[PDB]
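Dissemination and training. As part of the outreach component of the grant, students in the summer workshop were shown how a complex can be specified as a set of sequence lines and then modelled as a single object. The example used during the hands-on session is reproduced here so that future cohorts can follow it. Participants entered these lines:
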Amino acid sequence: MDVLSKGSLKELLAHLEKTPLEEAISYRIGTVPYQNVLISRNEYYNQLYPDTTSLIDGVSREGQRNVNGLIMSIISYVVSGSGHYIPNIGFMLLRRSILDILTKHDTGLVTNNLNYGIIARNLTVSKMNCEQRKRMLICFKLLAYKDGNQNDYEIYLNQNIPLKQIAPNFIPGDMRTVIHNQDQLAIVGIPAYRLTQSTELSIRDDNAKSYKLGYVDWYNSNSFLRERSEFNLIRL
Amino acid sequence: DVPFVQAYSKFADDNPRHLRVKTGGKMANALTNVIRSYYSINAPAIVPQVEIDRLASKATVSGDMYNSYAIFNSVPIVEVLSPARTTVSIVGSDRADVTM
Amino acid sequence: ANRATSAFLDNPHPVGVNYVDEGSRQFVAVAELLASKLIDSSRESDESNSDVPFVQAYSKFADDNPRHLRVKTGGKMANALTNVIRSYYSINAPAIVPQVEIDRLASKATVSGDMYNSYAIFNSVPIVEVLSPARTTVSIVGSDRADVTMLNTGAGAANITFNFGQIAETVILKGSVPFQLARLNQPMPAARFTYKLRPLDGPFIVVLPVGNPLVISATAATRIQVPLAFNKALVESGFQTAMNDGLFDIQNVNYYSSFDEFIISQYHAQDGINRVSTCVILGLALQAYDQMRRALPV
Amino acid sequence: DVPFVQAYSKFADDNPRHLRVKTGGKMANALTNVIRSYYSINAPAIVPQVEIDRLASKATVSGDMYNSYAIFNSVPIVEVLSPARTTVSIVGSDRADVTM
Amino acid sequence: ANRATSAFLDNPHPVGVNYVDEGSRQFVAVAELLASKLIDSSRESDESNSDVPFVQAYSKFADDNPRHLRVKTGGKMANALTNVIRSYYSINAPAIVPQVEIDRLASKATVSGDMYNSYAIFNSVPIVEVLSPARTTVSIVGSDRADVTMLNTGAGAANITFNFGQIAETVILKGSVPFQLARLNQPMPAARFTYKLRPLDGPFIVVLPVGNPLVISATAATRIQVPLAFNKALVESGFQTAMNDGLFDIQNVNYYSSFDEFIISQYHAQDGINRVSTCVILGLALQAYDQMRRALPV
Amino acid sequence: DVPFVQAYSKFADDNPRHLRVKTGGKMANALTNVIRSYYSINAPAIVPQV
Amino acid sequence: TSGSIINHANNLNKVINHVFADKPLISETMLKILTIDGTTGKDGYRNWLDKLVGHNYPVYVEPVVNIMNFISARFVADSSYFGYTNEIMIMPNHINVPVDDRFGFRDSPFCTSLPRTIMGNDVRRISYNVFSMMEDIDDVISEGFILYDAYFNFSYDIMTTDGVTRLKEDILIVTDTGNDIKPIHFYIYFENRNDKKLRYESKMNVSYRLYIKTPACLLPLSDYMRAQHDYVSPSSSRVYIKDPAVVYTRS
Amino acid sequence: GEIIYDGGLSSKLADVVDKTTEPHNADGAVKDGRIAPVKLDLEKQKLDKL
Amino acid sequence: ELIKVPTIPHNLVLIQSDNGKHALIKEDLGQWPVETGISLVNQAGVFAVQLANKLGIDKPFVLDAGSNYFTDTSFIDTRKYCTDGLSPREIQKALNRQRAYYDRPELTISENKTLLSQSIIYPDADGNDVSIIFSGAMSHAIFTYAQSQWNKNIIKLDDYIREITLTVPKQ
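and obtained this result:
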């Protein structure tokens, strides 16, 4: 909820600094992705409604323990609000924040030898919207600049013209580009008037709608409940 | 031209001008872009959400797409299995003529 | 080499040259406006218990108050509109209506009279010529949907040339079985069911293998500038009604199934851009004719 | 668009309007028709002189047509006479090439 | 039979597809505006000994004050304009200028980026094909005025078919001696010196009497929609400067003597409507290039 | 005719009159002679430096 | 419908009350005709207006109709001439926007046109009603937006000296029952580029800036020839006759 | 040394009314021509006037 | 009655900086409040009558500015310099102050005469006198349009008589 509410590059990067990797990953096994399933949408049809499970559905799915699984889990958290199930990551990586995993060399993780085309295919980039596409490219650029693979990032953008049009305009090493950036990246937010409490056809659309509807209640009643648990505890 | 000026001002968020051309404003650009995205999954789909929400707030109409029905007179002929020596031809969609 | 052409494209008769000035265009638009009021006031009067709305509308149209004994013909406007329609169709038709009456009738309402501010899409498929080899038989049936049935009895494949003219915007070709089609001096693509072509690109060559008759369905779209009040449904109804009433009966003219078929034929003939300018005014006149005669049938 | 509105009003005697073609007014028709009559004598002269005089009062100019000069580069070759054996051809107006 | 065609009409290379949106169109109009003000300020700066008016004009054009030690290249606007001209000419040329820079430059002055307000008349003669029978020699020379020299050695009179492009509006034909010309399957009129033709009418047949060569001089006029600021004198001068400066030197492109040949050749090609729209933007950009370089030579 | 009178007076150093030739004054004569001298080396080059 | 009848009755009474207030719109001759039966002047006029609704009577367009219509069209079309605009822009100081630089203003609040894109992205546009109900306004104003769907009244005072160009009041007021934009008054100063003190104040003291489209009434001095206009007065040898009657009484 | 910059009047973006305000329409830069919100005495507990 | 308007409402001011570097011409038509949520055209009509009152074009009028002129002391001038509108002297002072800031020479005699002769009054063929002055665009457009509308009702006496001849009795 908090990650999807951020609407600026500054706010998104600030949030990733304060958020440990534990929030990105999940401890629920979920189901295997890329499965043609029939779900129930009784609002519209009596028959079952076909759909395909993906990594950006907003529901935890099983993921491998390699470097790609950890990166895919982080990107899913940014664009869908929920991560995947990577078994036994270890306390050493869980305490580190998301940005250090993306943009630092002290994590002990070798993020080189990463193919952005393969990762984009696995995350179903063809199904995500402009804001989700923009957030995914931000993670790619941070990973590319840390490992000195700026050429491979440019090659990926050249092959994908639609992604090149909406590419973020910041440079990871320069602070001036971050402050002057005018991108809008807010998936959820408090809307003028309201939105009907009705279901949607797709798994992604319905889960995204559930986040928007619950944001208003989460905004008002989160400070006290979080503080009660935060008090008398040490942060990871 | 008073009625047209009011209507164009609401649609395009700008007054009509004699020297300038009447494109329709940002609503025209958004409407063209969403049409491109609807046709194929390879379309760019570039128009952001903040533009979509700001244009839906101009009028108060529900987005219900299931409150009525329409009849489409197209003839689906999935397959016409034919033995040897028999020749079958399917012509047309609105009215399918099968010659055997 | 054999040549096959669309039946509706041959010999477009000349159109009228009268009633194309600014004053006459205003009269046609005014006729459309007042005819629309007549139909709506007719339904309003029928719905309620008072015929006052109909009397008000008929008084403006016919310059006289309706009477029970007299047949509601339509007045001087009805007579003028019918005669102007005949003049448009053929240059041989007389120009009965004087200009002073047209100007008087055009002063009833304040309309622009501009006939080229909007557009409309027309579905007639122009097949100017299909050139075929000696052992090949080709037949073209239909205008709104053109079915080209091709059979070759030769030993090898035959190349058949299609020419859709330079006026149509897009042409979609569908076949019973997948087939090969490419422009001149271009490699043949793999067999596909559907082809989308720009007619201005050039003549299109289609490969015809032996046996297995291949029939191609053609659908075209053309854009013609028309007034904003143009309604294709009402124009088509007026065309059939005017044809049934004998408004188009005159020596040495061609007859068409639809106004769609009529306006495309004139466009493709020599001096076509100035021909379709008059045909558009005829379309708006027929749209007014359909509405007035439905309210006042004789 | 005020400067354009004022200029068009003086030229056409009618205020510019949206949803209109902006033809040019009565002044455009007169100029078009006098051009037709100037080309040859077979063209009709159908512009009343009252209309011409009324339009000539819109601006104050002398109307003199002999106070300056211009240079025209067309080459007049009225005749080129050659004997029986020779052949002569003339090509062009601005630059006449005579090949003999 | 032998076929003869105009030299400049053969193989028109593809044009660029970048910098054709609304933001880029405004940038070219802004550049044309500010470059024109630069020339006028320089002239007034020569009338009065003070260089202040030129300093103000250069500052608005180049975002910096003129400095005596520097070379006065035109600033960031001149670099953007030069790279934009390169992109329009060929699809192979890259697009260096970022969109952010163009948007910033376009905000200097308030202009309308529409490029369809007015029209311009171009004088290139589009002889698409000339078909001549055996024992006849036909040669075509020129683009602004085409001199078609023909001579037949056979005993019988020959018929030559002229196929001007379906794009030119009017074409005028003059001969050294009076000749006969007519369309397909139409009666042949008496010999005349001059003929005025509409190319849309169709191919034209000319008889060649045996014994003496016949030369036909052709002049054509075509209408292409251009912005109001368009000036053919400035565009033609800018085209030569761009060619001289080396802005059009890209592998696998075709070069033209004048801008009018360039725009006509692209028009007589596939997707000619779309190509001409890009060429019109190139013409206005070249007009800005001509005015700025005359004020600031390098 | 005031705008034309001032322009001619500056150009020709003389006031226009209704009964005179109005040929352009000494500036017109000097311009004619310098054009003659520029074209060929055999021209007199008559007009002095003062 | 009861709603239509109530709306018609209330609107009709408002028209009658306004028409008969101060100098009545209707002369006493028409009142005498409408009060022949016995009804009062207000009542007699009220029933006649109800009857005229839906009339097709042609009404001639008098010259003063056209004059008011012409002025009304220019009021809507050219809003900046009369002190109001249709949209405003609020941006932080650190964001560099292209502004009009013809008048030599220090931190000019005018732009030739409001930017379509800033730093490669389209500027967010929010309607005033949506902006009034926003509770996350603190996050939104960080990026910058354009307020539209409202009419904004503004005034400016051009000061001859040099100083910090600032607004008279704060940009916005935040209350529990919605947000609002405070009245806009500009203090525009001419710029001396080499004043380090006033340059630092502009960068540091003011944090947010408001931008509007440049008023068309303003015109630089170098373009004074654009203000040349022609007026035509009739000939002085004209006599105007007050009583054009052509006959006398026999007497 | 000489003092060039030492501070000055600082412009504040927002005026946060630290008190409860009854509902109101637009006033200031935008003036609302519609009628003010109607204060309705609804949801009474003890039944008065019935 | 038909009122006669002596002067033209230019509605122009000149604002220049103290150092003289920058100057501008501003047209002041006033400030008119606009209320949102209701139709703008209805408010425009109310302000239109007040605007016409300010410009003095509400009632039928005929402009007489022909006598608002003076003649220069030069012998070859023989031109009428209009008094109405923004005076060219103010533009000359503003331009001279601008040149002083840049250390440019002041306006020479030739340019001074050209600038001060910009506003003129000259007669046309029909006998009317045309005034060329410095004025605002909207003030010019509104004033000239109202002039055209009122002029439609001004007709010659002989034309008026011809319209009322049939109604005149014999007694």
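The CA atoms of residues 18 and 24 of chain G lie 9 Å apart. Students were then asked to discuss how this feature might be tested experimentally.
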